[PDB]
């Protein structure tokens, strides 16, 4: 199962809302904001019009990485493209396919693992908004990219995973053989290293080698810093079997302070050998 | 147009000089030192003889990354390849084309985005010299590489850009459609993440995909540490239009403290929409 | 030195965890010969390795590997009850596989790469104390046809140390001009680092050398790394640069200043190293 060629013009509503404990999040439905924000998926060539509403009492913005946007959708104070309290704005994201330019150079397409976040809450860099939870994933697919059975987003935000209390995962479940996609985003002040037990991926656009000629390093550990994003697909349990497979930041004190979760890979009967919570 | 094949013997004079406020810099002519130092450009195969003079009252050196040099041009005190106050020395850098070794393996060429810096001021690692401004860019081009309309060098040195006071850019100007080359160098104590608004590049040698078979990740954000260097070319405003396009370190406190500048992309008439200083 | 053959052998080795002087701990293949870093394990894709492991210490220890195939019983974690109690024995099994085309039409990557093993239970359930103490080592998995080196050297940036050594004590490595030298670079602990070698450069890809004229990988001499990262490469000693005492170091300025530096001593065939004067 593979992504089709893109070129659809899509529309969605998005809201920025306050959540419990001083947090803030994005959502597609009023009153249902989440941290991380909703996953937005596009095929190269698609256009997305985000009909955005700020329900909070502070100005907020939406800034996206990687995609094509004009200055009016930059989402910064510099370009007066933030949204006043209670205000509305349509942010527009475009994407393009790769292709040969007339001068013979190759223009890269938009495809990749990307993300969106606030750029105006607290500081002109969005330090408050990002700390509070205003971030989410974007995936742009190229025609023919393999589609996963499930997608999970892991954000290292300062010393938290997904703004959760320490030592609370999140955990993600799969069955042996599932094609599982991970989107990995980092935000805030610190560098991290992301590691998965029992699984590995290629350090390239899709996380999978294109074939026998792709020299990309195969890895299970990767250094990342604020606003980095990457992603990959794995076959759950491939060559290793079912089990509670931990993922964690590998900076030692970060793991000791709770930047750890479980990739729970189940047998067909739904059980997980050796896992006794 | 495009870079030709190299193989010329080139020469330049270089001086290390004190600048205002305890700073130090390299320059090609006496009294003309700059931070960053002068851009050196070579084609693979070229040899460069750097006729160097230390005009300061403390020893200094010149050490280069990536290029070929004999141990006598290492630029360290350990083999006495530094330059005493008032002294002169010729440092020689060579470069080579790619090609197959007699052992059957492929030898990479010298081409890339590189840099030179001091190795003896303050400590035998050059900590004081680098802090003071003794660093600059070197580009080595491969035959057939596309040539840019302009080149700009951005150095994250500790918590400054190009040793400038916080919140002073620098800014760079272009017109929509210009082919703009960025050289990005990091120095000092801290990791950083370089981000550009409105533009992106391939994480490979040139910043441009070689064609449809290149699997390199396309990015707009990249983690870097002391002495890392990379570069890329972008088409100014491609798919996004004119405007003041922010670049910054994405480590949140670094952006907030002033590691931010503007890529000012003008319409053909010279105006920048939505921008007034 | 030739090229790696196709794998598929079942191999066995004894490994011991032992205390070393000064609160340290290391792995070894023979009792009383533990080292930091631990012994280099080399496998060809398809090989299986049974590590007959014995913990000779008075505290629990484990063995956890990156990159290779292992079942949950060889995870080497307390949460999977695959640690080794004091005085205990356990067989840890690592498997490896070749690349190939899957049933779903996609390409499955092989196990080949520069990997590493380390403790996961000493001090904390992340192995923080064991890693600090020295319980880490390299493991290389080769693909059929990979070029073999004349020598392999392992450089571990563990916190503010290289290979747990006292500051300003190297290590140094020797080669002759033209030798094919393999470096395995591992990082552990709390800090990011940047590894730099004077006079030498490599491709930022699986093997450290470009596969040919179509490989677009960046060529570098400086690389940022963080805890549990591993990479490796092969260089031709002195290629285009000649003999000399070629420094390698972390390029984070305070780290170099505190002594995270060593020497790659490249000699001419007659043994000379121009200008070397320690
Ligand atoms: Cu920004
Ligand atoms: Cu972390
Ligand atoms: Cu692991
Ligand atoms: Cu951003
Ligand atoms: Cu150095
Ligand atoms: Cu920074
Ligand atoms: Cu941005
Ligand atoms: Cu350097
Ligand atoms: Cu672990
Ligand atoms: Cu370091
Ligand atoms: Cu150097
Ligand atoms: Cu690990």
Author numbering:
A (entry chain B), B (entry chain C): 41 to 317
C (entry chain A): 40 to 317
Sentences from the study reporting this entry:
Laccases (EC 1.10.3.2) are multi-copper oxidases that catalyze the oxidation of various organic and inorganic molecules (e.g., mono- and di-phenols, polyphenols, diamines, aminophenols, aromatic or aliphatic amines) with the reduction of molecular oxygen to water. Substrate oxidation occurs near the Cu1 ion (named T1 center), and electrons are then transferred via the Cys-His pathway to the Cu2 and Cu3α-Cu3β (TNC), where the reduction of oxygen to water takes place. 2D laccases are homotrimeric proteins, with Cu1 ions of monomers lying in one plane at an equal distance from each other and forming the so-called equilateral triangle.
In this work, we have obtained a double mutant form (His165Ala/Arg240His) to investigate the effect of the combining these mutations. The structure of this variant was solved with high resolution (1.3 Å), and analysis showed a continuous chain of water molecules from the enzyme surface to the Cu2 ion, whereas in the SgfSLwt the water chain was interrupted by the side group of Arg 240. Moreover, the water molecule closest to His 240 forms hydrogen bonds with this residue and with Asp 108, which is impossible in the SgfSLwt structure due to the side-chain of Arg 240. Substitution of Arg 240 to His leads to the interaction of polar amino acids (Asp 108 and some others) in the T2 tunnel with water molecules directly, and not through an intermediary (Arg 240). Due to the high resolution in the structure of the double mutant His165Ala/Arg240His, it was possible to identify almost two thousand water molecules. Increased amounts of water molecules allowed us to more accurately analyze the effect of amino acids in the T2 and T3 tunnels on the SgfSL functioning. The double mutant His165Ala/Arg240H retained an increased residual reaction rate at slightly acidic and neutral conditions. The catalytic efficiencies of double-mutant variants His165Ala/Met199Gly and His165Ala/Arg240His toward ABTS and 2.6-DMP are nearly identical to that observed with single-mutant form His165Ala. In the present study, the His165Ala/Met199Gly mutant retained practically the same high resistance to azide ions as His165Ala, and the resistance of His165Ala/Arg240His variant was 3-fold higher than that of the wild type laccase. Based on the high-resolution structure and biochemical data, we propose that the transfer of protons to the TNC clarifies the role of the water molecules chain located in the T2 tunnel of laccase structures, and the removal of water as a reaction product can occur through the T3 tunnel but not the T2.
